[PDB]
């Protein structure tokens, strides 16, 4: 069939990309702080 879009769930892709980027940043910063604080 056609007309398969009743509503929008655009947040899923945006949430995935943002969580990937921010988790990478947070884990890198945590590694840096742990190295700083031994």
């Amino acid at each position: 069939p056609c007309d398969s879009r009743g509503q929008r769930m655009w947040w899923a892709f945006l949430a995935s990309s943002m969580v990937t980027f921010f988790g990478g940043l947070f884990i890198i910063l945590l590694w840096r702080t742990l190295k700083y604080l031994w």
Binding site: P1, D3, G6, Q7
Partner: protein, 229 residues
Amino acid sequence: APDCPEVCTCVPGGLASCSALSLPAVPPGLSLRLRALLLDHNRVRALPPGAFAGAGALQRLDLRENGLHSVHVRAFWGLGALQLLDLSANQLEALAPGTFAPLRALRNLSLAGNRLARLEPAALGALPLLRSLSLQDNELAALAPGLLGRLPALDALHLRGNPWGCGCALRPLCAWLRRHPLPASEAETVLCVWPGRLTLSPLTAFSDAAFSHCAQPLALRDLAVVYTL
């Protein structure tokens, strides 16, 4: 009698008829003694706010074939007891939300033969006592989800002659139809319009398997998978 309009005809019991009078506007001097009012076949194109003020005890109101094109939000003032509305055979292209909110005792609402391209959930408002609806001969492309969620007592509906686009937008519409068996006479007259691949297809024959690819509600497994992928 003072409770009867001068140009209209009234009978004992509060039944007033103003048909075949070519009235350019709503007659004044409304009274609480009138229970039913007839106003069909007139030329009241514009309805002023609070036009029906005074007749709070009215039960039946008719405005068919009057060329209505715009109704104010507070036009139905003083009509908490109004039960029957006939706005069909008019040129209503849009309805202001909250217009039908005071109609707590509404039982029949007519919107046939109108040019209402879209009907919104907030346009109907809270209608718990409503039992039936008529939306035939309109330009309703699709019913937005949630419109039927505020009509618990809705048992009858007419949808013939509408540009129903058979997709996922009318899945809630089919949900009502599955549990409300439409008569075969009316069901055979209800069909899809677009796309052409689904022409001549009745709306009652579309099951869950036909639209399993539609947007399902968000779950908890996929919610974690989309984050973790």
